[PDB]
Design a protein around this ligand. Structure first.
Ligand SMILES: [Mg+2]
Ligand SMILES: [Zn+2]
Lengths: 50, 50, 152, 50, 101, 139, 79, 98, 161, 51, 51
DNA sequence: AAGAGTATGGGTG
């Protein structure tokens, strides 16, 4: 969706955005797993286990 | 022969033309003013390619 | 101001909504000159309606006519420079990347002002004295001021 | 270039330099990640000695 | 404190007079005519008063008539009319002949 | 407001050296200025650069090839022109590269040049050891 | 002219004098009814004047000579 | 925001300020210094008289631009006359000479 | 530390110029700022504008009055051609704030100084402003005597005499 | 002025000057400046809305 | 090319940005990947325990 | 009887 310049990170020393980007990637991955499990109707037991 | 030819001519040129007094020039100005026109207008690319 | 990466050093990007208001009497004269309008009120109404021919007229009247871009605070004479406009869509001014260092400008909220020279002397002064293609060296020390930076 | 050849070639050269730099910076794919900030392995030993 | 300038009917009329190809005599006549226009758009004096106010005897009444006819086609149409009939006829003369009635 | 006042005065430019570190070479202090005296070769009395020469890159290269030490140049302080200065006491126009023209508002340029970098300055708060091999002079 | 004016500056020798001469020639072309000495290619009068100056066809002395010759011709025709 | 012409102050006869008033941009002292450092005298004079407070110059410039004749006829700014009147109101005789 | 006034009085103009230039460049080099030495020199030249007469000589100057250096040098070079003797003097060093307060134009002074004091003193003295500077011509909307306007001021000057 | 053309041409003239003079003003100079004497502190009638 | 091992200049993104002069300096990289160091009290005196 | 030092007021930001 967005393209940001990596040249603005090192001199500003605001490293929180990189960690936030990584953690948001991980959260979206978990959400994608759940969505794929929901699309193909699976048992409630597998959903609650994951 | 056309209004575009007439409006490009100035008052001085009409006055210097033979057989044209001040009364006829005033009449021409009056009839042009009746249609919202005047003497002394400038046009580019005339005659209009016809 | 936004960044124009495609521009040449002597060019700037001007919105046409601004340019229509800035060059209004020039457009009136050009409309009256080629027979589209017979009186001043006809040209005024035609420009108010923003018909399709007024855009051709505007593109014809700004072809070679410099404009002055200025950013505040003006610390040295490089804070005002002359550029040739290119009509663009939108509402933001596009700036050449190589002049920003002279303006001390960045694209995170900065605004710029634009002025139009009127007389022939002003236009020739803008072309011969204030054009960015003439302001290559620094008047303070004689070094180049259009050096590349960052991404380049 | 300015001292040897003059003004106009310098302007053309500057424009070409900007174009080429932008193009190849885009092509490189340079990015910033958390693993780029490499910590030396002797930092804790130096701190302990101090 | 200070206010701002406002454009009246006479200011608009003089702005249109400025950008009209008049001669010096015609421009002076137009200035007098616009001076003799009230806020409803009607002429308040006869053309004899304007001719006397011009101040020279080389000018006839038909030149004043021509200048008045040119002015009456300014915006708004029908301004500087002598009377109601003149204003109505001036407004009608700007309509196309395809009008039904 | 003038081209040449005809003066022969000037100031002596030498490299700025503190201790053993060279803070400023000569070429960075005489580039674009006009010599107020004939430049002589260190070893002889032969003239190297004549009087009233605008020192551009070629002349500076010639100076640094022959190891010229100090150069006398014209300055606006010792200018004979009243109500203004002359072109030769000022020298090169830094923004253009050639000599200055008549009718230039150099005072405004100087004030702007000094004041523009003023935003980068902070407002709020035993033995001589030689390094190279060379002759020793005592003054 | 369209990008840089270095050649015209070298021809005239001064930027201010160049601006003055170019303005005089441009006003001659725009309002005086004169025809350009170079083939105009969708150019404004200022750029045409600059191109004429950089080609060596226009300077202050030439303009003065032309003006004096035109005045002499007008006064001869008046007689 | 942009402006060609518009309304002016009653006293100073200069363009108003602000987008809501359809005003113009301010050309301050530092911009004047920049123009002086360039040596662009005609641009500065045009900015000082026919664009701000030369009442007859504004109209003449507009008419000339519409006619296709890019030439100005500069006059005296009105703010200078206001200053002269204000200084005279203090009991001091200040006048233009010759 | 040595005061610049004593350097000017004992060593001369060149030494104090070198001292001021070197000090300013030392302050600016700590931040890595490149400024040519010309501009500091023109500022110093504007600082060294006055001169104090030490002997009246054949001129009409007083015993110890302080006046413009250009006037003194013009008078001395005029007298020296007539076989007379000029007046000796000593250069003076002032700050920029005090140097700018010695301008000979009350319009220019009132533009940026204390308006009331300047106007009162000018009205008492009955002064007359010739409109020779940039700011004075900016106030009245004329061409500045610099750049493209410079020639315009020359012809006028040669149409007055 | 009788001729309206010259009358209109005469009200758009620019005064010529080359110097500015400043001095003190005598009572006679102040009286020569004025067109009349103000005697009342009222400004607007507020009934006819006239001065 | 022969299967040996050599040492060359790094292609690390932060090092490439700093070495080319595009963005950043040595002190900022030290703050990013090494200790931040000693700080100062508002008066100006150094705090004996660094970050 | 002058001359150096201190307190007060004006101006600037
Ligand atoms: Mg910003
Ligand atoms: Zn000199």
């Amino acid at each position: 969706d967005i393209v940001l310049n990596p040249l603005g990170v090192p001199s500003r020393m605001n490293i929180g955005q990189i960690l936030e980007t990584h953690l948001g990637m991980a959260a979206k991955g978990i959400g994608d797993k759940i969505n794929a499990m929901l699309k193909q109707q699976q048992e409630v037991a597998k959903l609650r286990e994951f | 022969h056309y209004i575009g030819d007439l409006v490009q001519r100035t008052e001085v040129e009409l006055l210097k033309t033979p057989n044209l007094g001040k009364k006829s020039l005033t009449e021409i100005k009056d009839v042009l003013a009746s249609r919202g026109l005047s003497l002394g207008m400038r046009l580019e690319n005339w005659p209009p390619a016809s | 101001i936004t960044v124009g990466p495609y521009l040449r050093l002597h060019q700037c990007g001007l919105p046409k909504k601004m340019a229509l208001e800035l060059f209004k009497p020039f457009i009136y004269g050009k409309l009256e000159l080629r027979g589209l309008a017979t009186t001043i009120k006809a040209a005024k109404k035609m420009v108010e309606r923003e018909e399709a021919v007024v855009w051709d007229i505007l593109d014809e009247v700004i072809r070679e006519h410099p404009v002055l871009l200025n950013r505040a605070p003006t610390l040295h004479r490089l804070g005002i420079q002359a550029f040739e406009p290119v009509l663009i869509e939108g509402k933001a001014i596009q700036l050449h990347p190589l002049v920003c260092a002279a303006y001390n400008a960045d694209f995170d909220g900065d605004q710029m002002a634009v002025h139009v020279p009127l007389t022939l002397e002003a236009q020739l002064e803008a072309r011969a004295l204030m054009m960015s293609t003439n302001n290559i060296l620094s008047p303070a020390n004689g070094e180049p001021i259009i050096v590349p930076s960052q991404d380049v | 270039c300015y001292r040897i050849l003059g003004l106009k070639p310098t302007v053309i050269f500057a424009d070409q330099i900007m174009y080429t730099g932008f193009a190849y910076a885009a092509r490189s794919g340079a990015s910033v990640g958390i693993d780029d900030m490499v910590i030396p392995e002797k930092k804790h030993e130096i701190i302990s000695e101090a | 404190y200070q206010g701002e300038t406002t454009q009246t009917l006479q200011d608009y009329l003089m702005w249109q007079v400025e950008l009209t190809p008049f001669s010096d005599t015609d421009r002076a006549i137009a200035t007098s005519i616009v001076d003799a226009v009230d806020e409803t758009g009607y002429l308040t004096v006869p053309l004899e008063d304007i001719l006397e106010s011009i101040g020279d005897e080389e000018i006839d009444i038909d030149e004043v008539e021509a200048v008045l006819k040119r002015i009456q086609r300014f915006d708004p149409v029908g301004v500087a009319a002598k009377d109601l009939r003149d204003c109505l006829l001036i407004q009608l003369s700007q309509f196309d002949k395809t009008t039904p009635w | 407001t003038e081209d040449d006042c005809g003066t022969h005065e000037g100031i002596m430019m030498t490299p700025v050296i503190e201790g053993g570190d060279v803070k400023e070479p000569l070429r960075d202090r005489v580039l674009g200025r006009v010599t107020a005296e004939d430049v002589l070769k260190p070893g002889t009395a032969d003239i190297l650069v004549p009087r009233n020469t605008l020192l551009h890159e070629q002349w500076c290269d010639l100076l640094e090839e022959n190891s010229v030490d100090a150069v006398k140049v014209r300055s606006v302080v010792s200018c004979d022109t009243d109500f203004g200065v002359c072109a030769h006491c000022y020298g090169r126009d830094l923004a253009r590269g050639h000599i200055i023209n008549k009718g230039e508002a150099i005072g405004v340029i100087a004030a702007q040049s000094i004041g523009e970098p003023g935003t980068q300055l902070t407002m709020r708060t035993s033995s001589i050891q030689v390094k190279n091999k060379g002759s020793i002079k005592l003054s | 002219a369209r990008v840089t004016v270095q050649d015209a500056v070298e021809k005239i020798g001064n930027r201010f004098d160049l601006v003055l001469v170019a303005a005089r020639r441009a006003r001659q072309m725009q309002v005086g009814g004169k025809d350009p000495l170079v083939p105009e290619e969708n150019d404004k009068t200022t750029v045409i004047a600059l191109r004429e100056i950089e080609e060596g066809l226009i300077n202050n002395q030439i303009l003065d000579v032309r003006e004096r010759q035109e005045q002499q011709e007008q006064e001869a025709a008046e007689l | 925001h942009a402006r060609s012409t518009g309304s002016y102050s009653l006293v100073t006869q200069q363009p108003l300020g602000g987008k809501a008033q359809f005003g113009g941009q301010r050309f301050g002292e530092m911009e004047v210094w920049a123009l002086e450092a360039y040596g662009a005298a005609y641009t500065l004079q045009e900015m000082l008289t026919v664009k701000s407070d030369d009442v007859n110059g504004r109209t003449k410039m507009y008419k000339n631009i519409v006619d296709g004749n890019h030439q100005m006829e500069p006059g005296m700014p009105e703010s200078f006359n206001v200053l002269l009147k204000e200084i005279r109101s203090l009991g001091i005789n200040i006048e233009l000479e010759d | 530390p040595e005061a610049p006034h004593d350097i000017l009085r004992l060593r001369g103009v060149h030494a104090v110029t070198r001292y001021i230039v070197n000090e300013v460049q030392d302050v600016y080099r700590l931040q890595g700022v490149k400024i040519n030495d010309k501009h500091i020199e023109v500022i110093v030249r504007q600082m060294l504008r006055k001169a104090t007469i030490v002997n009246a000589g054949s001129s009409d100057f007083l015993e110890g009055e302080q006046v413009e250096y250009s006037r003194v040098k013009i008078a001395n070079r005029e007298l020296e051609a007539n076989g007379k003797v000029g007046a000796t003097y000593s250069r003076d060093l002032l700050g920029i704030t005090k140097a700018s307060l010695a301008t000979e134009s009350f319009i220019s002074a009132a533009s940026f100084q204390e308006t009331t004091r300047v106007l009162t003193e000018a009205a008492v003295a009955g002064k007359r402003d010739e409109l020779r500077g940039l700011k004075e011509n900016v106030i009245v909307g004329r061409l500045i005597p610099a750049g493209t306007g410079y020639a315009y001021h020359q012809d006028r000057m040669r149409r007055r005499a | 002025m009788k001729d309206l053309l010259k009358f209109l041409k005469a009200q758009t003239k620019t005064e010529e000057f080359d110097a500015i003079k400043i001095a003190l003003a005598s009572p006679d100079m102040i009286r020569s400046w004025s067109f009349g004497e103000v005697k009342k502190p009222e400004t607007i009638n507020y009934r006819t809305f006239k001065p | 090319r022969d299967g040996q091992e050599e040492k060359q200049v790094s292609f690390n993104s932060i090092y490439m940005m700093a070495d080319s002069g595009a963005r950043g300096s040595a002190a900022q990289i030290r703050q990013l990947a090494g200790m931040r160091g000693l700080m100062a009290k508002p008066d100006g005196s150094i705090i004996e325990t660094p970050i």
